[PDB]
Amino acid sequence: NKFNKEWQNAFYEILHLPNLTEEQRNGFIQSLKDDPSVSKEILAEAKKLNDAQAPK
Numbered sequence: 745n746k747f748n749k750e751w752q753n754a755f756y757e758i759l760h761l762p763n764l765t766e767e768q769r770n771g772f773i774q775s776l777k778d779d780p781s782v783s784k785e786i787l788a789e790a791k792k793l794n795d796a797q798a799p800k
Contacts, residue, residue, distance in 0.1 A: 746780050754787040761790055763797040 758772045760763075772790045776783055 751776065751780050751783045754783040754790075757787060758790045761794040763794040763799075764790065768793065 755773065755776055756793075758776070759771060759796065764772075768790075772786055775786050
């Protein structure tokens with residue numbers, strides 16, 4: 745199914761990633777909406793970015 749539990753978990757994980765600016769956050773969210781089938785890969789990249797942006 746297009747908007748499965750997968751898609752849902754990615755949305756709320758990305759929403760709560762701390763090190764993303766707001767622009768980045770809503771960018772990954774827009775991608776999730778524009779292409780639900782790749783929700784897994786969007787989530788990975790968001791974590792990858794969030795983690796690459798921890799202060800100190």
